[PDB]
Amino acid sequence: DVGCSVDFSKKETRCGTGVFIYNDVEAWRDRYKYHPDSPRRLAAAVKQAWEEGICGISSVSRMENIMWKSVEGELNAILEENGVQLTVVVGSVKNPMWRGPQRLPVPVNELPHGWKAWGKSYFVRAAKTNNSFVVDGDTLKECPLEHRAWNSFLVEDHGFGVFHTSVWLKVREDYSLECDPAVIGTAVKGREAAHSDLGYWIESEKNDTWRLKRAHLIEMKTCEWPKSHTLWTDGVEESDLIIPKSLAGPLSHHNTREGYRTQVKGPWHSEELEIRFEECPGTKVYVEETCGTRGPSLRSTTASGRVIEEWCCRECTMPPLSFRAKDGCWYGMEIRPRKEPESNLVRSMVTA
Amino acid sequence: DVGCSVDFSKKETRCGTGVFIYNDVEAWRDRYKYHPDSPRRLAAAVKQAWEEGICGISSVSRMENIMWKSVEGELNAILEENGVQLTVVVGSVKNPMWRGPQRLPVPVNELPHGWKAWGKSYFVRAAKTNNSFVVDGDTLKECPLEHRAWNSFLVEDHGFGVFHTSVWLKVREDYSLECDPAVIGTAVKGREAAHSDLGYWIESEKNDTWRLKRAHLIEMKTCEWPKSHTLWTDGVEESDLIIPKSLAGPLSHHNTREGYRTQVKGPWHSEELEIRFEECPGTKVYVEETCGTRGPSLRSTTASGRVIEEWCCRECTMPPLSFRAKDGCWYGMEIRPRKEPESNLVRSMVTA
Amino acid sequence: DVGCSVDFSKKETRCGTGVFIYNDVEAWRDRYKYHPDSPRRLAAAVKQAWEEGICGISSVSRMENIMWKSVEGELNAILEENGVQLTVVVGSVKNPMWRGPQRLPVPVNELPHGWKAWGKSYFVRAAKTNNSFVVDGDTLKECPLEHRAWNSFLVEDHGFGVFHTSVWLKVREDYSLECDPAVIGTAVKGREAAHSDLGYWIESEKNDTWRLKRAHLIEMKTCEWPKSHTLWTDGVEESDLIIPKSLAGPLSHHNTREGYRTQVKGPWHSEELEIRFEECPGTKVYVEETCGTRGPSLRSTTASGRVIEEWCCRECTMPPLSFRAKDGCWYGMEIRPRKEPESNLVRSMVTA
Amino acid sequence: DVGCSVDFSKKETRCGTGVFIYNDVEAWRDRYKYHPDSPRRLAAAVKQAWEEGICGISSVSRMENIMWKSVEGELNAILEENGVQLTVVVGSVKNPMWRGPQRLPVPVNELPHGWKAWGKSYFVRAAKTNNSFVVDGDTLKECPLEHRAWNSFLVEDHGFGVFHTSVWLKVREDYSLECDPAVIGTAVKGREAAHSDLGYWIESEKNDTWRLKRAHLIEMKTCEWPKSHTLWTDGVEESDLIIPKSLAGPLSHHNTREGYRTQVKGPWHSEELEIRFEECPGTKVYVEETCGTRGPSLRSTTASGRVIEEWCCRECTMPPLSFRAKDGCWYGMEIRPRKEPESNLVRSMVTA
Numbered sequence A, B, C, D: 001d002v003g004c005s006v007d008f009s010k011k012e013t014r015c016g017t018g019v020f021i022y023n024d025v026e027a028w029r030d031r032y033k034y035h036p037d038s039p040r041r042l043a044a045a046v047k048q049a050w051e052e053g054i055c056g057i058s059s060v061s062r063m064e065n066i067m068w069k070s071v072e073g074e075l076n077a078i079l080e081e082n083g084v085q086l087t088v089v090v091g092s093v094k095n096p097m098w099r100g101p102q103r104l105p106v107p108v109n110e111l112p113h114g115w116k117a118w119g120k121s122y123f124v125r126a127a128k129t130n131n132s133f134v135v136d137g138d139t140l141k142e143c144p145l146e147h148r149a150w151n152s153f154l155v156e157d158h159g160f161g162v163f164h165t166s167v168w169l170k171v172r173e174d175y176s177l178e179c180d181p182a183v184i185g186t187a188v189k190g191r192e193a194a195h196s197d198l199g200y201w202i203e204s205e206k207n208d209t210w211r212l213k214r215a216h217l218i219e220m221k222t223c224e225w226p227k228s229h230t231l232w233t234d235g236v237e238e239s240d241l242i243i244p245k246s247l248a249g250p251l252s253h254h255n256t257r258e259g260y261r262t263q264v265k266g267p268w269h270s271e272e273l274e275i276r277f278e279e280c281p282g283t284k285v286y287v288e289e290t291c292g293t294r295g296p297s298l299r300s301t302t303a304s305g306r307v308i309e310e311w312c313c314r315e316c317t318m319p320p321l322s323f324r325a326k327d328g329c330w331y332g333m334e335i336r337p338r339k340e341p342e343s344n345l346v347r348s349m350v351t352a
């Protein structure tokens, strides 16, 4: 990779070989195609899974859901044309994207019909059938999470990633609990580190020790960050990782901070989350030894919009840990209201 | 931090934000032009060290030796302006750069007055004395190894919009055994990892497993690579690292290969070394259980230049491991000749 | 302009000073956001334009239309506060954007600012009223072209945008048929040339002569390209400008190719367009003197998706001219099917 | 290509792809070592030229003269060993270089490469052959302009050079009065224009109209600027070109200014000029209709260093034109002294 950079603290400039890591979270990437292997093979796999009793799918990330939405209609058309009666219906992703115990089997043979749908870009109708292969969506009662598949697709190549911008996939053969390595990038240079993938951008710094600086999450996954793509992965205890290991947080020393423990019960139901170590607007935080213990994260403002003004923490170190979302400004587990009834506090919905 | 990018494998052009890592190994010639912070205080420290029994400084990296060689004149003048009797003699760098029990003291106060040094750094006139604060060189007899100082210099700032960017060093405050963190860059992106600093460039890739691909060594240090700049340092035994831990090799799973132990007795005396996994030119290797055991490495050609074309090893995996040096191609420790007297084989020099 | 680059024909690096022109059409992230300098001045001007008989204004460029979309709410709210009966409603893009006889007159005064208008924008669009300053849209029946403004804006200044350069505008004073020069950029570096603005990119090259090499269009203006920013204007015949002078094509010898002429009946209805000189999969052209005459472009495939493979050209040169739109390949006005019914050909309506 | 930029005019740091044109004259960063692509073939060319009767060659560009002096020894070493009596002597360039009425003969076949001539360079010379093939210099008496070769070479290609690219050359089989178009570069960006090559750097901008701004000439060619690299060719009259078309002034409206005619009697005998528009040090020009006629350029200081302070111009414009050479400032044709004897004035020379 031949490329350049322009420093912002200073203004030095230089171009030359190396390794370049790009922030695709705030950039919002671009339009993509997401060719899930051979649409015929995907149709055969979904039919075979339906035979076994796999009633639906829960997207692991926000690219798989978009791929399913894109190929919905054309998969339905392929199914109708063949001697198969099954409808694929998709929906909206609800965070956090929970786990599933099933995997889509790889078909032994392709369906016996013409393969004119390679790259099918939707734009086709089909007849509705009673039995449906629900994907994501609010079809919880219809298809319980028990019989739902999860993490079955494996990125293969990035053919024509400059202008076409297509990410090709294929159904994986072996069981795994691991996130996709192909879209992960980690880097450290001097006193700045950054772990990231298509939806996570974590930043760490050095101040007498390596610690967490800032994080921007546009989704809440549940896979496991691979160890081969994380820095300093020895002697680390899981009780100190700010982003729990159950939400795809690196198992690393850069993933911690002094005075804080695992944030397992935060506002993980939001759509966009930014972790900033700074006081919530209009509120003050102090360290007192009489403050309460750790519990669910609470929002700064009440239901009617009134702002709370005094907060306390037991052992946290300023500046505090606060989550920023479209709903408002939240606070960490260690930070509790100084004096306020629990009625007006909007606890986060527990994530189990 | 915005930067260029063009990958020739995919011809993809990108422009974004993040962390950009560069290969600064070729530019070892003239990467910098500077002097340590306030060479007046450096002269004070040198004198105080001389009073306490520090007769020499064995450099740890080629950058440090170059700094000493480029500041010799000004430091000598500052010594021969107050009344100090000390001669700084800077020799050549002998690989591998070895260790020093002692450390350079931090002075309490500067010298009484050295303003003449201001504005007079390169073209400075002084005289010679009897006392010799030798810096490396071929002076083991004069100042033995046990009385030298080693790895007592840090970095504060570096890089500028110029061909030679000033680097402001500083005397270390406390004991330490690790290489300089400020000049290390690690990065993994998909199936390509890169560990690197100003003299090392180690490359790894995934082929059904994370392995070692290639390594370029312009020096042979003896510090210890910091773990905070290492990928996947969990559950790794030090007997499998290809580049030993005693020659500042990363303690990671990316720093090994299957069928090869640690290479303690390689050709660590060369000026420039490249580690490659490919058959040594003109020769061939076979996998046989009746070949020789582990020991010092051997050169492909004899003293007169005769090419040895037959080699064997017990349990290695092809392609073999060969060290490429200015002298020539050298084989791995586990690879031995099938039919050749040990008198005709050049044994590598091992320094412990 | 302090900066630098990497030449990828020879793979060389060099940092210095000069003039730098960038390819702003194929940009990963947006850098320019049209805005109005004085929304009060714009609102007064809009009211007066309606009073003298302008029912709407056709956007000249997509980015001006985006600005109109953004301002719609604030303009409606502020007009309603004072009591003005005007209701700005913006339609969707239709290509090309036809020129209008009228010009937005410069307002005599400035519209007053309401107390609640501070910060009220992007969501305060007002109800439809008798006076409706429609903008763009495929609704010319409501607003005839003869009573539509066109190109009444100027680049007052280039505001500083760290992430997105904000460009503020003021109502034009001079009636001109010329594009905005504040965003134009032309260059020749030996044999490579480039004409560009916000939405155009016309590459050119040298092979025994100066000929068109490629292009890219994300809109379809109707301005006239200034000669001050054109290379080799003199001596050109308008009948040979590939991109017609009516659609803002440069008047130069760089805007031409041998064997072709003005393409005025091309796929100018497409939303985006890549003019490329080569055949695309599933076709073939043979230079034959008996082929058909010059007529509107015909897509390679049929309405049912069947591809015509035999093509003939009268006096063309290989490779041919094919426009890559969002639907698929097309072939220039000099390229006709060898043998195919006219019914199965998707002709493109001439834009005039 | 992808490029750096930290422009300090607007402090807008930008990156992207496009065309980058670098200043090379004002910075004197002539980082190109001119060489012949086939220095061996040139011996046959000079021999054939001498057979016809070309007594000498006058350089068209300072870099051609640099090449000639660099290859003087290369040619002289071989010429003695092929039974050829011809010695090339390269002098100094006398600005402004003149237009010669012939070119070198086209080579017939390759001249054999001698064994001992190989490796001989400008450190070894021929021993005073009877006929001397002079290059440049004040040898007009020895060989007049009437038999001088002029502009017979063209840049063949660009060699690879980290710090100094080796420009390659080849003989032209044609008669063209045009400058080397493979080292030219032109560009307009918003309001910023620049016509450039190895030795010229003309600058232009807009203030109510496109007018010349400044220039920097480190030589005085006599080639004609091609119009394929000029902005706004059409409509220009040669009589208005500030820098004469005979001294390689671009044919455009950026090459001209209002209130000035062509300056064909300027200080064209200098060694380097900086044309600029501002009053000479401590002088004053008045606008009076009774001033003198157009005439040579008169320096501000007389032969003894006395300054003239009162100047006039009839159809004048301000700030005035004044070319700054290494001897001092001069005033344009239209600017004449109000009251001063003609004997104390300095008059330039026209190299028709």
Ligand SMILES: *[C@@H]1O[C@H](CO)[C@@H](O)[C@H](O)[C@H]1NC(C)=O
Residues within 6 Å of the ligand: A207, A208
């Ligand atoms: C961070 O480090 C700097 C020096 O690098 C130190 O002065 C500062 O106190 C540290 N902490 C904060 C919160 O800035």
Ligand SMILES: *[C@@H]1O[C@H](CO)[C@@H](O)[C@H](O)[C@H]1NC(C)=O
Residues within 6 Å of the ligand: B207, B208
């Ligand atoms: C892995 O290595 C083997 C042997 O070196 C080679 O044949 C193969 O192409 C490599 N690549 C992969 C993806 O396994």
